[PDB]
Amino acid sequence: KVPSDIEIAQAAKMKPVMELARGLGIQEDEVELYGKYKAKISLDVYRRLKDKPDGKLILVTAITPTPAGEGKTTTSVGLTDALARLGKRVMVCLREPSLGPSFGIKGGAAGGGYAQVVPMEDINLHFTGDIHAVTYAHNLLAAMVDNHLQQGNVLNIDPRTITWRRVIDLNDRALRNIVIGLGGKANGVPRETGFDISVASEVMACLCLASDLMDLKERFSRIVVGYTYDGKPVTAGDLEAQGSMALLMKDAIKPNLVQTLENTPAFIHGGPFANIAHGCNSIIATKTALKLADYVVTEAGFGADLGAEKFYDVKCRYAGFKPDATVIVATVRALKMHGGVPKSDLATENLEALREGFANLEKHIENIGKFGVPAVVAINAFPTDTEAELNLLYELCAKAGAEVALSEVWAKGGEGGLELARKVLQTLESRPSNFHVLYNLDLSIKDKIAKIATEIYGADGVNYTAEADKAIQRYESLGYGNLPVVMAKTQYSFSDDMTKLGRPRNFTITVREVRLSAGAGFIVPITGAIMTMPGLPKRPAACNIDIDADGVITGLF
Amino acid sequence: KVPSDIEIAQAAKMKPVMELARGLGIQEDEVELYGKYKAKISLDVYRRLKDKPDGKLILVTAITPTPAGEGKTTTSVGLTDALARLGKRVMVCLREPSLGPSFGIKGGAAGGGYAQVVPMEDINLHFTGDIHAVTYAHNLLAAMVDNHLQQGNVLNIDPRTITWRRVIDLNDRALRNIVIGLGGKANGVPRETGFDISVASEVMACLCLASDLMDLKERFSRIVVGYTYDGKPVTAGDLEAQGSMALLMKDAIKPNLVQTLENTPAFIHGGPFANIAHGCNSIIATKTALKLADYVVTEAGFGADLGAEKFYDVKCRYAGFKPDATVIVATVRALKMHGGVPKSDLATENLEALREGFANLEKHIENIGKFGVPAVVAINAFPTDTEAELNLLYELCAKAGAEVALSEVWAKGGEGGLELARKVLQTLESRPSNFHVLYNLDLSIKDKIAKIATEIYGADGVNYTAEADKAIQRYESLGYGNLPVVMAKTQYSFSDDMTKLGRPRNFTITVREVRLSAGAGFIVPITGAIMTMPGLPKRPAACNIDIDADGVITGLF
Numbered sequence A, B: 001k002v003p004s005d006i007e008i009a010q011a012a013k014m015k016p017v018m019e020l021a022r023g024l025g026i027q028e029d030e031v032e033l034y035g036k037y038k039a040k041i042s043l044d045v046y047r048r049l050k051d052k053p054d055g056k057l058i059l060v061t062a063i064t065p066t067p068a069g070e071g072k073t074t075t076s077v078g079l080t081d082a083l084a085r086l087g088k089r090v091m092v093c094l095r096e097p098s099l100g101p102s103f104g105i106k107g108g109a110a111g112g113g114y115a116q117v118v119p120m121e122d123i124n125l126h127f128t129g130d131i132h133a134v135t136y137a138h139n140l141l142a143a144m145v146d147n148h149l150q151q152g153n154v155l156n157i158d159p160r161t162i163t164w165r166r167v168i169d170l171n172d173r174a175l176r177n178i179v180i181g182l183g184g185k186a187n188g189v190p191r192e193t194g195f196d197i198s199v200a201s202e203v204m205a206c207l208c209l210a211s212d213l214m215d216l217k218e219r220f221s222r223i224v225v226g227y228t229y230d231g232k233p234v235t236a237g238d239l240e241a242q243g244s245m246a247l248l249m250k251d252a253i254k255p256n257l258v259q260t261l262e263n264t265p266a267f268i269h270g271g272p273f274a275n276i277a278h279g280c281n282s283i284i285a286t287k288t289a290l291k292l293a294d295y296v297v298t299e300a301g302f303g304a305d306l307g308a309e310k311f312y313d314v315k316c317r318y319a320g321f322k323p324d325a326t327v328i329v330a331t332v333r334a335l336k337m338h339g340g341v342p343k344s345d346l347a348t349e350n351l352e353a354l355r356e357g358f359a360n361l362e363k364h365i366e367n368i369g370k371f372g373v374p375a376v377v378a379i380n381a382f383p384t385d386t387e388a389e390l391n392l393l394y395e396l397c398a399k400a401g402a403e404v405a406l407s408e409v410w411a412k413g414g415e416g417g418l419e420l421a422r423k424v425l426q427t428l429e430s431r432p433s434n435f436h437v438l439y440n441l442d443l444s445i446k447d448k449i450a451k452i453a454t455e456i457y458g459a460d461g462v463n464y465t466a467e468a469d470k471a472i473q474r475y476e477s478l479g480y481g482n483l484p485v486v487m488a489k490t491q492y493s494f495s496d497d498m499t500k501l502g503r504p505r506n507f508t509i510t511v512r513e514v515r516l517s518a519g520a521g522f523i524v525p526i527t528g529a530i531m532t533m534p535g536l537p538k539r540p541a542a543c544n545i546d547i548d549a550d551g552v553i554t555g556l557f
């Protein structure tokens, strides 16, 4: 019945963004176009509306992701659209995808089916240059670190302690571990380093946490790149790179106006990793949306154990936001995997594995309650789901205390989300939220980790390797112990063990390593090995990709 | 140099309490005397002052108790006294001791040395009859449970499910496990039960948590005594015992006015266990003190892991109190035991075991911070403590962020607490508190236990026996899962293992059993075996006790 994703995006009729912008009260002079259907928007908009009250803030999140798929963005856009149809003044804020995936695994829609922000092609690729700006802001510091050594090493860095890597927005595994500065006294200082994907760059994180260009610059100045032979820290400030980086980011600091299929305005801006970073779109975009609109839908990376958690405990913390509702997105299928059913038999009805798996969802609902935010569940409808199945899922959500709404936004655009929209509105008019972060900053790193781990993961306790112990000891005496904590762990489990589906009990977390992003302003415990630069597959999507004389692009999606 | 405790109490000159009472603004008609030096005070005092603002609330607590002793009450009274000397309008609120200990181990001062509430003799013994009233309110329900069975068992209790024991205020071990109702159809219904010491009676708990006689009566009506053969709960309400119990407690519901050696007014009122109950004096006394005074000192049973915790999470919760400071009482000696030094070598200087043991204190200080209450440490001075020792202890407290003050109240009454008083005043004028309970009631019992366990005990996780699992399951479906949780565990460790002194790491808590006090309004997880009716020793203190023709009492203290 439904057309594929890509073709739906092309045949959509989009409105001139300048139109959308004046519709929202943005003045033409605060708009810088990129074609007819993209625009950067001035940080001045926010500045003149600082005093106006915020609209409502609605977070989208989901249950523990599985191979079976949940489609969280699909829901976000479709929720946005329904809200627009019900006459509400709404925007959606989303993250910019990394360019690289478009060539290994394939690019995919911002959403999918009929729930999508457009123009699709651009947003996957260069969009408005935000990631390029991030790439060169980042690598300029790399080159300045290297130039400093080359020029007599005045700050007295021990080159072997350098933590500041390089970045690029392609999936290139060979760039993981490299030795640079070879060739002789004229070619720099030989040393071991590597590349991570640009979207995992701390500079990408900063962008998303910054309040403006001047706040962004000040963060840059706090970036720790490595240490002295004495074990004193060396920062970008010390290298005096901030102005430059800040300059490279002058256009990057502005959110980008675009639209859903059905022309609902949308910001797309920033887009960090959700394991080593907070997996949220920029504070700047979102804070602007609240001024321009009465309702703002936004989402978070990975399951609610991670994105939701970081959204509240980091994003809202810094921005002084107080989310008003949270929507958890789930499917019958993912729940059944969590209840034990293998990927190939997900089609066979099975109310028992569905009841078993529901625990995963029950535990997320519960977590969101721990932040004082009322929770609505979205069920991404799927054709093989039986009535018995869906019904059970309703009973179970109600038993567990949350409104539930079946969503067919994928299939039917904004119309497939109208009951969901109504449930959210219903929750907003009758269950105002009592926001508070899960933890105070004045705790210790180990206190902060344990509270997340036990309150959110349902972990028994936390383990630490010797290397992690010295890190935390070091970081605390360097005065970074009153920072937020950002768990990088698997997203496929509440546990640090990705094989443990559903709601695992009697387990512990092992923190193996602890890293720092003093620019972004947080501490990063890592549990498994974390892949900050994925590789291409056996056949890369790039082998099929072409564009012909007409400009007809095949093999891409 | 110093006289013993008892003789100090006798030679003290006490003022007529009616005097103290009019001094505080209590009208004569709100006073019922018991001699010249005791009075019950009307709940009407509070009622007419409900609108006045509260004075400051200052909690006294201590580090993990050891065989070496810490003297927490000594500090409380002496702190009260210093405050009085500095011209401040202050009262102290303390618990009534159990009568029984006076005959096994020996009675002891309310405080000690020169820091004491008087008249000593009375407060150990019958005082004003509060515990007797508790004993008979309690046992009337026992006798009504038994009468009900005898009279045809209309409510259809399964006598073997009866949880409501009997109580008495002596240490009588033989009364632990008994079979009653023997002799035949005319003598009641044969069944297994026992006695606990009166001060561990739930009715004692209720008294301390009640807001008035009518609130107290309503609590009584919610007491669960046992179940039906169907597994439905049976309450005192169902037995219609509340009015009666409420009647037995008509005088008991009034706090008792008494004084310190130096004539500072003092309430003594209620006095529950601190493991299966919250180890605090009555809300009623304390709430009245805040109206009558600008500063109120009160204390809590056991270490800060227990009393302090329950004081905040139960007492302040119910009463809507917001403590303004908390004083932790410690000694060089107890810290050294915690650092490893055996009881016999506590006299030998040892800065290393003192540094090691300080961890215990550091961890308590830290906990009190988790409730948003600024912490001052009191050092009970002891003659064998060296300058090097005390100095180290100061450096360590300051390093750990809390004011510290050496206290010689034992030796020198109110004068030995003047620096401490000044430090508290100093903390009150410059570090206002941000009170919040450790946890929300809407969590699950297992969530609530784990948060206490991990945040306060520094436990890894929590274990549960099968019997505890069904209890919690039962209690939750009976609708008692949104109640406070009251840990009964050893007081000699942060862990449930009393052999683990100092600051134990990598341990778990095992909850073996879970009980309910639906009158008092909380849930009682138990970890070790909990002794709710201690025994007399080899030689009981009672074998030496006498009073002669003059009335000279020997052998008692």
Ligand SMILES: Nc1nc(=O)c2nc(CNc3ccc(C(=O)N[C@@H](CCC(=O)O)C(=O)O)cc3)cnc2[nH]1
Residues within 6 Å of the ligand: A071, A380, A381, A382, A383, A384, A385, A386, A387, A390, A391, A406, A408, A410, A411
């Ligand atoms: N990737 C992907 N995601 C999708 O969401 C998706 N959806 C469809 C078609 N959508 C659907 C969704 C739900 C039902 C369904 O469950 N129908 C019930 C609704 C039950 C209720 O209202 O409670 C029915 O009564 O027909 C059928 C088709 C096809 N391919 C997809 N592919």
Ligand SMILES: Nc1nc(=O)c2nc(CNc3ccc(C(=O)N[C@@H](CCC(=O)O)C(=O)O)cc3)cnc2[nH]1
Residues within 6 Å of the ligand: B071, B380, B381, B382, B383, B384, B385, B386, B387, B390, B391, B406, B408, B410, B411
């Ligand atoms: N059970 C009991 N408790 C006590 O508190 C107690 N105190 C004394 C006598 N009190 C004390 C207390 C402290 C110092 C002491 O440490 N003196 C130091 C003060 C150090 C400082 O100010 O930092 C000194 O300089 O003399 C001496 C005697 C005797 N028996 C007791 N018995």
